[PDB]
Amino acid sequence: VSKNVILLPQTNQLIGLYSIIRDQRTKRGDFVFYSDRIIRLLVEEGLNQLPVEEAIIKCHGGYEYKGAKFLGKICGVSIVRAGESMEMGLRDCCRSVRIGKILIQRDEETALPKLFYEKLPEDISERYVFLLDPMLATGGSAMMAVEVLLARGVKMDRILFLNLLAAPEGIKAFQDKYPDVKIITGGIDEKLDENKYIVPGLGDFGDRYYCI
Amino acid sequence: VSKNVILLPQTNQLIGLYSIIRDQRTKRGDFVFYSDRIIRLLVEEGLNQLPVEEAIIKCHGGYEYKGAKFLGKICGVSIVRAGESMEMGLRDCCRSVRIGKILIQRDEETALPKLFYEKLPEDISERYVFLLDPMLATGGSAMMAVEVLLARGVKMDRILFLNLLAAPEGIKAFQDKYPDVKIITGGIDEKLDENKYIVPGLGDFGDRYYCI
Amino acid sequence: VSKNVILLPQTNQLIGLYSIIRDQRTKRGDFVFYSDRIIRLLVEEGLNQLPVEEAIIKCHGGYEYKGAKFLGKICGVSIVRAGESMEMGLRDCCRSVRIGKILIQRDEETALPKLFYEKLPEDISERYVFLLDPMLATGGSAMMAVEVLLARGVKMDRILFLNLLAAPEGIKAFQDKYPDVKIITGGIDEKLDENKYIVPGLGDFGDRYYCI
Amino acid sequence: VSKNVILLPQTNQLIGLYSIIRDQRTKRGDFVFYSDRIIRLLVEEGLNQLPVEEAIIKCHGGYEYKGAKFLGKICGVSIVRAGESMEMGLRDCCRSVRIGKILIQRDEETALPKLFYEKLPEDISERYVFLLDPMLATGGSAMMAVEVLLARGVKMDRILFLNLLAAPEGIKAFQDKYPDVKIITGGIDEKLDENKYIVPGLGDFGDRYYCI
């Protein structure tokens, strides 16, 4: 696996878990539940990248524990309607965490990125940012969204891109443009299909999470 | 660490997380939230012990994925009122999982274990059992509860004891009596205090989770 | 309906909702989900009994709203293992609310109530107390638990007993002994069976929520 | 209150609850928690509008209960990024419910509504639709979204618009255009401000829920 691509440990349990959401017979309730469990694993892996400092912790009864304090401020940012699914996993790990939104698409007439919606913390330049997109297929949207974050002052080495599954094409595209962004993914699949879906993939993540 | 004691990886993030719940200044809302996050980490580690089989998974679009199917049926069993806190973490990982209850105490007059309450799945003898007790201090209650499970036909090597923190005294006592039970813990602390609390510990887990 | 018995409004939706959990074909996942939704309705009805004071609320932009502030401190107390199910509904309505536990049974030899476990807020005498027991059949356990609360200084008119279903026998027994305790219930059924289950009822609430 | 405007009962508890989220001193954690509790109240009120049929329910032990079955299929549809907050409340009441998305804005050049994103159930024409937008200020977005639903075959009298707060201006605009859509709201405030925020309102719902 390439530099700055962090793959969840491919345990027997993780493969069994991914097998549930991949299986085309898995219905929406189970698809949502188990996707949410995977999303929490991605968030935990991404949080393992953040810095800490040693700290003495006072425990009840007058005892001291040699512990640690978190040094990173965090927020999540979702980018397509499908990334919204990931917000709950993030908020189950990071209490009341801030979550922003970037909705950005190539302008059909000028072929340049164009922003449809933005909501970000006012101090986002001082934060680590978990970019939330469940499927890294081509990486088109995620690359446009990172450019917005960088324009808003976010440090390149404080952006972590969480996704359930990635294709090699998207990893390559994204890393060619943003080689210091860490990609946290739960699986790297084979290729894309002609509609740019990941293969073997899991069908349409957003449709399965929300509608079908 | 001894045989059949499985310690969560002691990452910077995990130490920072434990430091929140240990800190005597952490109030109930934060104590509950972050304990719940730790409990989910314990459940995920325990689930990594369960068996799988390879399985071809059919994915949308006619693709096949070489995946896996879970082979273990599971349930959780909590044992003191404090273990009840752990039920939500288990049910966030294992959809609608069965959860039993064993309330058992030494008879003050005969000094022999006496059962106050029991509710277990009718097929518990065919299941893996996550025994839920947040603090492994002396291990007294957990040992009595395991004896009940074994009397009900549960296989010794299908019992996994999840706890947030353990003392050496409790690990030794428990493993001397049930050496094939796996203990999944998030930290092993120094010793016990004269009221049999873990040191440095985190005060009274149940009081902090529920009442104070 | 008698004095101090507060019945949830028997809307078409509520009957449809109760019909899901009553139906013997409803499996555990659906039974848990819909019971939890009902439990939240019971908590909301019970919270409607608590006092408020008028208060001017400052809203963003320099506006004032004639609002209100809650005057009651609250906690929940569950009493049989089955009441534990209700804790999550209470904590989805009252953020990080304190929850106590009373486990009390008649002494088989002396026929007098005997306490197996107690954990209550140190200031419980100053709180409203939601007593949590899903089924008010005979009311035996709930009556013993109320006596403990009153011994601990809880005001009689600050105890609210939440239950999903009640039998007339239990309402009568409980109200004969504690006529100033409000009973909040979602349905009053016909009678008890010879094993003291409510009829037509919903089978064994605890078994269905947890084990079967 | 006008025809087809359904106001949550303005209980002491509801006013106390709204006072928490209105208060400009309420921080994000409390704002999210209590908004979510209100959103569930809106969903329950909206569900009370849906049809049922009488049904005999078989209960354990051979008993029959004269109950009811739901006749409406449902989905939610959110419309601005702020409506996404409401999805969790809906999914806590309606198990695994389908949720769609309509992102639609007036074309700046042609002044005609233009669709940026749509994801709806394939059978949405057969469903009741909970339109989710936390603040009914001008109603501009909600009116454009309803037109999309009607174009997709949704029945006018199966659309229910859930919002936490409404201004008279938005109620009037929306009802002038769609008089058979039911509006379920938790409060009707005084007027709009020059940036079209509700007064006295609660500031910027989306900013407070997510970012600030």
Ligand SMILES: O=c1ccn([C@@H]2O[C@H](COP(=O)(O)OP(=O)(O)OP(=O)(O)O)[C@@H](O)[C@H]2O)c(=O)[nH]1
């Ligand atoms: O590495 C980390 C960093 C942070 N966190 C957790 O993420 C949560 C958000 O951590 P933040 O430090 O970003 O808080 P915030 O700025 O949004 O908070 P306020 O100003 O609104 O008070 C915090 O509870 C923290 O413990 C982790 O879990 N791991």
Ligand SMILES: O=c1ccn([C@@H]2O[C@H](COP(=O)(O)OP(=O)(O)OP(=O)(O)O)[C@@H](O)[C@H]2O)c(=O)[nH]1
């Ligand atoms: O290793 C495992 C095993 C099981 N599980 C998950 O635990 C859940 C419970 O798995 P069980 O296999 O114990 O289901 P059950 O017997 O209680 O189910 P019913 O008979 O009521 O239908 C299942 O959704 C499974 O996917 C894991 O997550 N990991």
Ligand SMILES: O=c1ccn([C@@H]2O[C@H](COP(=O)(O)OP(=O)(O)OP(=O)(O)O)[C@@H](O)[C@H]2O)c(=O)[nH]1
């Ligand atoms: O009528 C009420 C009263 C209280 N509540 C809600 O119940 C929650 C608990 O309200 P409490 O007032 O009991 O708080 P507490 O004493 O346990 O809090 P700390 O001392 O630990 O700080 C509070 O967030 C309150 O808003 C209601 O929702 N309705």
Ligand SMILES: O=c1ccn([C@@H]2O[C@H](COP(=O)(O)OP(=O)(O)OP(=O)(O)O)[C@@H](O)[C@H]2O)c(=O)[nH]1
């Ligand atoms: O009035 C109602 C109607 C429905 N509901 C609840 O909303 C949930 C969704 O009810 P639906 O009937 O819309 O289910 P669905 O079509 O999406 O289900 P599948 O085809 O995927 O199997 C169901 O569990 C129902 O009980 C209510 O709570 N109240």
